[PDB]
Amino acid sequence: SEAVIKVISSACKTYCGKTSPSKKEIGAMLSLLQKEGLLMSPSDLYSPGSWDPITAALSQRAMILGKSGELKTWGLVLGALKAAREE
């Protein structure tokens, strides 16, 4: 995607600051969400209810395969979006 990623970058850096995820991480993780059939479009990230299955799926593959690559990026984006949705 293009716009969706930029929207996240300007948002996460407002909460996490310098501890925010890199654009390269977001862009790569987004494709993972689609390939896994978790989300149809990157814009689906605006749905807070859909965060539950995604987070669960990520933690599952992380504890089973031993890879938290997408989990690390998701955790940051999730936290930023969660805080934003709380306001």
Ligand SMILES: O=P(O)(O)O[C@H]1[C@H](OP(=O)(O)O)[C@@H](OP(=O)(O)O)[C@H](OP(=O)(O)O)[C@@H](OP(=O)(O)O)[C@H]1OP(=O)(O)O
């Ligand atoms: O030119 P800008 O409007 O200031 O945006 C850039 C650009 O991001 P986009 O390609 O999504 O517009 C950089 O991407 P690249 O040119 O390196 O491919 C990205 O760098 P990273 O992908 O390595 O994160 C950088 O972010 P940063 O300044 O944290 O290095 C980010 O700048 P902004 O985050 O301030 O928009």
